[PDB]
Curated annotation (Swiss-Prot), chain B:
The keyword Cell membrane applies. Transmembrane segments: none annotated. It is found in: Cell membrane. Coiled coil: none annotated. The transporter is composed of the integral membrane protein KhtU and the regulatory protein KhtT. The keyword DNA-binding does not apply. It comes from the Bacteria. Keywords: Cell membrane, Membrane. This is K(+)/H(+) antiporter subunit KhtT. One of its GO terms (biological process) is potassium ion transport. Required for activity of the potassium/proton antiporter KhtU. Involved in protection of the cell from methylglyoxal, a toxic by-product of glycolysis. Induction: Part of the khtSTU operon. Induced by salt stress at alkaline pH. One of its GO terms (cellular component) is plasma membrane.
């Protein structure tokens, strides 16, 4: 369906994983590590096995980018 | 270091060009009407787009909350 869909999973001892599907039907996974590290993975719209891009951010970077993204 | 360059796009919105500690690069366009567009480029080639995503205002805020949490 076409709305914002977020699936959250605990990664025991490691952090939290968020799998997001947007209204534009684009796919992203965000891992938030307990130590502060953020990892974002972008996958091919129609192929989960195909990684388009990925980025690792420390805590301060993630918060700065989040401030921009969300106003 | 984390480097951010902000420009105004007159009558359209704002552009943020971001370079991270990992040397990765992204451009975020924030439209006046609330749309966000995010572009990810090759670290060494500004001409090669790795990925892009379009978000509405609500989606942007929700994703920001996850990222900044």
């Amino acid at each position: 369906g076409s709305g914002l869909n977020i699936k959250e999973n605990d990664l025991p001892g490691i952090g939290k994983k968020f799998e997001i599907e947007t209204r534009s039907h684009e796919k992203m996974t965000i891992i938030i590590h307990d130590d502060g590290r953020r990892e974002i993975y972008r996958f091919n719209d129609r192929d989960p096995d195909e990684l388009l891009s990925n980025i690792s951010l420390d805590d301060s970077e993630a918060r700065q980018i989040a401030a921009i993204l969300g106003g």
